[PDB]
């Protein structure tokens, strides 16, 4: 990435917000952490080093052993998830005056994310804070095939979406380890068990899974992994080969719709493609890494619904001077909304914590029913809507049993895909809607 090739310490004056590009080598420790985390405490400035997962958190916590820190006495670091600082900046509990912000994988799209870049960037413009964000793929990638540590060779390919009975060769023939990027956990099932059927070991990473099974990819003992767009966010696989669908399932919300859809499968941001990439081309000392692509890139994202839900984070994160926060300069042209026009009133904004918290709905869902004036405990919202916001499963219309007795047909008032789109999916907001949590 075009980012800072180092850390120097003039990046810990006021004001200043500095991309740092990541080109992690073949080595197991990451060295520029622990470097920044001592430059911190030279400098007396309260830190916080923001992770993307909560794996990479605890990398992180291992590699810092000797160095006060606080993983989230009179430390002046702490160590903690990009959503676990979002988390706490929406509730009434005091955050620390962090002088200095530290964004591991800065590129990262969730909406939490999106939003900690925000109150960061506010900060920074204040002259309250000084940010580094460490990514390879800052806003505004274009170039899906940056420069490397080591060569790529770069190779367009019919890449499978199915089980195969015959051909792909090229796939089960390779002795190395293969990384295999593609759009929808079910999709990578039927892949998985197509290559375990020809007696491949196969890791299934994704959001769901990736705490327990990440720790499995350490070990030599595997053949493929088959990754959603997660381990875009710091995987580092022992591997030398990756292949890429070049496809993703994304919610999106559509100019002044009134609902949340999914698109795809549908091609990748280059943001995203160049980070599948850099899985691979590490070791200086390696040539012949491979990355297998399968169809183009887009720069078209302003339909995905995490800008939005950014934004609906945003406007919430109530600053002690009363300055309403903007987010990240160059994804300021990713919303249309003015300032602070999602802003919850007091009772609204606690009910929208406890859905995003304990209800586990989406933000624009959560958004939607707190503005509205419903209570935490009140799911006549889930009831109450409009015909075509009837919810169906497996072709019929589901019936709840309320928990005040009457048995009704889930329809609700806003309608968000992500949260009837599977199996899981269902069964999590019909137990929301019965009031089982």
Same mark, same amino acid.
């Given at each position: ?204 990473? +994704? ?11 350490? @070990?030599?003992?595997? &053949?493929? !992994?088959? #990754? /959603? %767009? ?85 406007? +919430? ?11 990240? @300069?160059?994804?300021? &042209?990713? !919303?249309? #909304? /003015? %300032? ?98």
């Amino acid at each position: 990435g075009p980012g800072s090739e180092a850390f120097t310490p003039d990046m810990l004056k006021k004001r200043r917000l500095t991309i740092l590009d990541l080109h992690p080598g073949a080595g197991k420790t990451r060295r520029v952490i622990p470097q920044i985390v001592r430059e911190c405490v030279k400098a007396r400035l309260r830190t916080v080093i923001l992770a993307p997962t909560r794996v990479v958190a605890a990398e992180m916590a291992e590699a810092l052993r000797g160095l006060p820190i606080r993983y989230q006495g009179n430390e002046i670091v702490d160590v903690m998830c990009h959503a676990t600082l979002t988390q706490r900046l929406l509730t009434p509990a005091k955050v620390p005056n962090y002088n200095v912000f530290v964004m591991d994988e800065a590129h990262f799209t969730d909406p939490a994310s999106i939003a900690a870049r925000g109150y960061i960037s506010t900060k920074v413009e204040l002259g309250e804070a000084a940010a580094i964000f460490m990514t390879a793929t800052p806003p505004g990638t274009t170039d899906p095939f940056p420069d490397s540590n080591a060569p790529i060779i770069d190779q367009e390919a019919e890449i499978p979406d199915r089980a195969w009975n015959s051909g792909f060769e090229w796939i089960t023939e390779y002795t190395g380890k293969t990384v295999w990027f593609v759009p929808s956990v079910r999709m990578g099932n039927e892949i998985a068990m197509c290559l375990t059927k020809a007696g491949k070991k196969v890791i299934q990473l +994704n959001r769901k899974s990736y705490d327990s099974e990440y720790q499995k990819c350490k @070990g030599n003992d595997w &053949d493929f !992994v088959i #990754t /959603t %767009d997660i381990s875009e966010m710091g995987a580092n696989f022992g591997a030398h080969r990756v292949i890429d669908s070049r496809k993703c399932v994304k919610p999106v919300i559509l100019d002044g719709d009134d609902r949340v859809l999914m698109n795809g499968p549908a091609p990748i941001t280059p943001a995203s493609a160049a980070q599948r990439r850099g899985r691979i081309g590490r070791d200086p000392t390696q040539s012949g890494d491979e990355y297998f692509y399968g169809g183009p890139t887009t720069t078209d994202d302003t339909g995905h619904a995490h800008w939005i839900e950014a934004k609906i984070l945003l406007d +919430n994160i109530q600053l002690q001077n009363g300055l309403v926060a903007q987010l990240y @300069g160059p994804e300021r &042209d990713k !919303v249309f #909304t /003015t %300032d602070g026009e999602y802003r919850l009133r007091s009772e609204q904004k606690k009910n929208f914590v406890e859905f995003l918290r304990t209800g586990d709905l989406p933000v624009w869902l959560s958004y939607k029913v707190a503005e509205a004036g419903y209570a935490y405990t009140d799911r006549r919202w889930c009831f109450d809507g409009p015909a075509n916001n009837t919810i169906l499963e497996d072709n019929n219309e589901v019936e709840i049993w309320t928990r005040q007795g009457e048995k009704r047909i889930l329809r609700p008032r806003w309608s968000d895909a992500r949260v009837y789109c599977d199996n899981q999916a269902l069964r999590s907001f019909k137990e929301f809607a019965a009031g089982k949590r």
